[PDB]
């Protein structure tokens, strides 16, 4: 998160910290959010050979009793996810067992301001953050994201005032974008120089597919 503040620890009990395993390189990291005791929503491009989920975390380098490190049994990436257009950047993770409900861990059931949180990098050349950072971003008209050639208003949200530095960035993918407390978007992609706006998956469009996956599993 660029241009944000450190969250009050555990003020966002649904936040999930993802460690992703591939076969040809070291681990990668994304965010995500617990929508069912055993289901975590994140970005399609965070998929890997295997994934571990830590719930209840603030400072991700210091273990604490709030922590729930959970195994992912199955990854449900959207079937139509496109590595060329980046369309349908969305994935459901099924946890091996249902998470415990605690104070620190629980499910989450243009021109306006939304908020987005993550453990991602705090600047173009900065490392990922140790602690959960958040930032408030402006929801933009779709023409503000026209320069992303495959951006699609129906599928995506355009997020972030270009006059401001604030933004999600690497490591923040899969995190929820909340407007008035409700999840509206998912961190997906943007420019490598982090100049806003950036592109978020529009959750509402994928709601049928989401419900589909839940009931079948
Ligand atoms: C997080 O924890 C580590 C030690 O576990 C510490 O070195 C680091 O400065 C901490 N960061 C914050 C801001 O709490
Ligand atoms: O909002 C975001 C998320 C993200 C990931 C990676 C890059 Cl290069 C840019 C952005 N912008
Ligand atoms: Zn704590």
Swiss-Prot record:
The active site is at 45 (charge relay system), 89 (charge relay system), 173 (charge relay system). It is found in: Secreted; Cytoplasmic granule. Glycans are attached at residues 59, 82. PROSITE patterns: TRYPSIN_DOM (PS50240), TRYPSIN_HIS (PS00134), TRYPSIN_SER (PS00135). Its main location: secreted. It holds the Pfam family Trypsin. Belongs to the peptidase S1 family. Granzyme subfamily. This is Chymase. It comes from Homo sapiens (Human). The gene is CMA1.
